[PDB]
Ligand binder design. Structure first.
Ligand SMILES: NC(=O)C1=CN([C@@H]2O[C@H](COP(=O)(O)OP(=O)(O)OC[C@H]3O[C@@H](n4cnc5c(N)ncnc54)[C@H](OP(=O)(O)O)[C@@H]3O)[C@@H](O)[C@H]2O)C=CC1
Ligand SMILES: Nc1nc(=O)c2c([nH]1)NCC(CNc1ccc(C(=O)N[C@@H](CCC(=O)O)C(=O)O)cc1)=N2
Ligand SMILES: [Mn+2]
Ligand SMILES: [Mn+2]
Length: 159
């Protein structure tokens, strides 16, 4: 099964100038917890924004160019990415925008964080048909001393 995980600000913004302007440690804890010990698939731009391999996870990067780092696995197509994961229960697709768009039709599950933030961005989460998805978990949090915005963890499963 293929899953997508993402953090969306208002108007499905997910990034700006190859970075994420907000800082939500609670959300990054949620990301870690839901990805650890699973393969993660990402695009090249997202690899360059993270800046390092994510520990405890098989890092798989999509790029039409040859790899420039043997600490991670490089692939050249969507099908090859999926094959490189092997026989695992859950593949996590961690973006960015162009990668998300390609894996959304294959995905059975979405892990979305909705952040109450107004941010100008250049990258959006793909527009998905709400009828196709059933919310099976929701958890709202108010802002606190560590998290400057209110946010909502949501898990959706394809109907
Ligand atoms: N808020 C969130 O949840 C997340 C936000 N982001 C943000 O998204 C932005 C980056 O997203 P985006 O600009 O769309 O870039 P992507 O991360 O989606 O990566 C795009 C690159 O990945 C390669 N690629 C994608 N698909 C293929 C394919 N089928 N075959 C071969 N190569 C492929 C290409 O590399 P190449 O050009 O070398 O061929 C392409 O240029 C950043 O700002 C990041 O911070 C990222 C993840 C999560
Ligand atoms: N919900 C969600 N939030 C995000 O911030 C996110 C996402 N999903 N999907 C992809 C993505 C891409 N960018 C990044 C950037 C940094 C880390 C990172 O440093 N993660 C550490 C966090 C450790 C912690 O704070 O607990 C990790 O080990 O996963 C991960 C993904 N970011
Ligand atoms: Mn197999
Ligand atoms: Mn806010």
């Amino acid at each position: 099964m293929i899953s997508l995980i993402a953090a969306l600000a208002v108007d499905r913004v997910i990034g700006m100038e190859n970075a994420m302007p907000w800082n939500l440690p609670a959300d990054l804890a949620w990301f870690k917890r839901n990805t650890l010990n699973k393969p993660v698939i990402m695009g090249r731009h997202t690899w360059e924004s993270i800046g390092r391999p994510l520990p405890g996870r098989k890092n798989i990067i999509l790029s039409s160019q040859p790899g420039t780092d043997d600490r991670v696995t490089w692939v050249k197509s969507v099908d090859e990415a999926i094959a490189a994961c092997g026989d695992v229960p859950e593949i996590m697709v961690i973006g960015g925008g162009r990668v998300y768009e390609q894996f959304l039709p294959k995905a059975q599950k979405l892990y979305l964080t909705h952040i109450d933030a107004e941010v100008e961005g250049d990258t959006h989460f793909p527009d998905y048909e709400p009828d196709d998805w059933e919310s099976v978990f929701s958890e709202f949090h108010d802002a606190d001393a560590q998290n400057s915005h209110s946010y909502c963890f949501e898990i959706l499963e394809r109907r």
